[PDB]
């Protein structure tokens, strides 16, 4: 066919990051830790965003009110943030793709930007039409002693290597789906790979504190309550 897609029709599919708890209240969250140095990954709740370093483990937790159906699988796919880029597939760099896959005895070949750790049944699929890559795994019951489930993700490229992330921030969408292809719940988060995930998390927080000024509690109340004078030059 000469049309070779990318022309009039069919139009490329555009995934949406719209949250939808659904019946089982499917939610996503990332455990919090002190601002330690060389942190593999750190998350800020105020901004709903995660910073990670390449090849480091980022455990993520799913929270639901009642365990999903048996046979259900969890999906995770990377896509660009703005629509102008979400129609373009995210791929590997020329330098980092050239490296040998070393797939012998490995569950996650480098060919996929996102990989799973700690599940021998992790497998990857390719979108037949729009190229997108994604990885899937069977949902297991919540860990013993708590009500949530843990999945370990790994990234094989970093934001600033040309030909993959190419300085373009992206979003990751994680969904709970039934064996018959029906969606139960969808949640999404924003991801960045950087040299110091600890440093970027602190920086955005400092930007908010500067904008917000707190009133000292030395006095129970102001007698004059006058707003005279300049607040910010
Ligand atoms: Zn790369």
Curated annotation (Swiss-Prot):
Widely expressed, notably in heart, kidney, placenta, prostate, skeletal muscle, testis and thymus, although the precise isoform varies according to tissue type. Progenitor cell layers of skin, breast, eye and prostate express high levels of DeltaN-type isoforms. Isoform 10 is predominantly expressed in skin squamous cell carcinomas, but not in normal skin tissues. Changing residue 134 to N: In POF21; uncertain significance; no effect on transcriptional activation in a luciferase reporter assay; does not affect oligomerization. May be sumoylated. Residues 19-211 bind DNA. Residues 210-220, 224-233 have a biased composition (Polar residues). Changing residue 128 to H: In colon cancer. Residues 200-233 are annotated as: Disordered. Changing residue 168 to H: In EEC3 and SHFM4. Residues 201-233 are annotated as: Interaction with HIPK2. It is linked to Acro-dermato-ungual-lacrimal-tooth syndrome: A form of ectodermal dysplasia. Ectodermal dysplasia defines a heterogeneous group of disorders due to abnormal development of two or more ectodermal structures. ADULT syndrome involves ectrodactyly, syndactyly, finger- and toenail dysplasia, hypoplastic breasts and nipples, intensive freckling, lacrimal duct atresia, frontal alopecia, primary hypodontia and loss of permanent teeth. ADULT syndrome differs significantly from EEC3 syndrome by the absence of facial clefting. Inheritance is autosomal dominant. The transactivation inhibitory domain (TID) can interact with, and inhibit the activity of the N-terminal transcriptional activation domain of TA*-type isoforms. Binds DNA as a homotetramer. Isoform composition of the tetramer may determine transactivation activity. Isoforms Alpha and Gamma interact with HIPK2. Interacts with SSRP1, leading to stimulate coactivator activity. Isoform 1 and isoform 2 interact with WWP1. Interacts with PDS5A. Isoform 5 (via activation domain) interacts with NOC2L. This is Tumor protein 63. The gene is TP63.
């Amino acid at each position: 066919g000469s049309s070779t897609f990318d022309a009039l029709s069919p139009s490329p599919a555009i995934p949406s990051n719209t949250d939808y708890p659904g019946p089982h209240s499917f939610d996503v969250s990332f455990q919090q830790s002190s601002t330690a140095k060389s942190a593999t990954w750190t998350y800020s709740t105020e901004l709903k965003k995660l910073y990670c370093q390449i090849a480091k483990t980022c455990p993520i937790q799913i929270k639901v009110m009642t365990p999903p159906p048996q046979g259900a699988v969890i999906r995770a796919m990377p896509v660009y943030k703005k629509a102008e880029h979400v129609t373009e597939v995210v791929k590997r760099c020329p330098n980092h793709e050239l490296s040998r896959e070393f797939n012998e005895g490995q569950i996650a070949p480098p060919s996929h930007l996102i990989r799973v750790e700690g599940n021998s049944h992790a497998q990857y699929v390719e979108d037949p039409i729009t190229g997108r890559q994604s990885v899937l795994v069977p949902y297991e019951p919540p860990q013993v002693g708590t009500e949530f489930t843990t999945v370990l993700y790994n990234f094989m490229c970093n934001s600033s290597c040309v030909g993959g992330m190419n300085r373009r921030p992206i979003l990751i969408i994680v969904t709970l789906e039934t064996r018959d292809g029906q969606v139960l719940g969808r949640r999404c988060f924003e991801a960045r790979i950087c040299a110091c995930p600890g440093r970027d998390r602190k920086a955005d927080e400092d930007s908010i504190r500067k904008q917000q000024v707190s009133d000292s509690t030395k006095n129970g109340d102001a007698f004059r309550q006058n707003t005279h004078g300049i607040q910010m030059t």
